[PDB]
Design goal:
The PDB classes it as structural protein. 3 copies of one chain form a homotrimer. Chain A is low in regular secondary structure and about 30 residues long. The first copy, chain A, has no helices and no strands. Chain A is rod-shaped. The interface of A and B includes residues 15, 20, 29 and 30 of A.
């Protein structure tokens, strides 16, 4: 009969680094 | 006859977290 | 008779982009 299935394929390519975060809040009130 | 291909590999790893955002603006006068 | 094993499966799907970076620090004091 047909042979067993092959092994799982290799892991996909890793993703790019995440985007830079937003600016912080305004500083403390004077 | 030869067996079929295996299943797809695992999904790629996510990218690492993005870098910290810029400083916020100066605080208001008070 | 039993067939030879199949070939490796397809390469996995690409990894996602990493998460958004953290916010920046607070600005200077007012």
């Amino acid at each position: 009969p047909p042979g067993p299935p092959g092994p799982p394929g290799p892991r996909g390519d890793p993703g790019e680094r995440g985007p830079r975060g937003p600016p912080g809040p305004p500083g403390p009130p004077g």
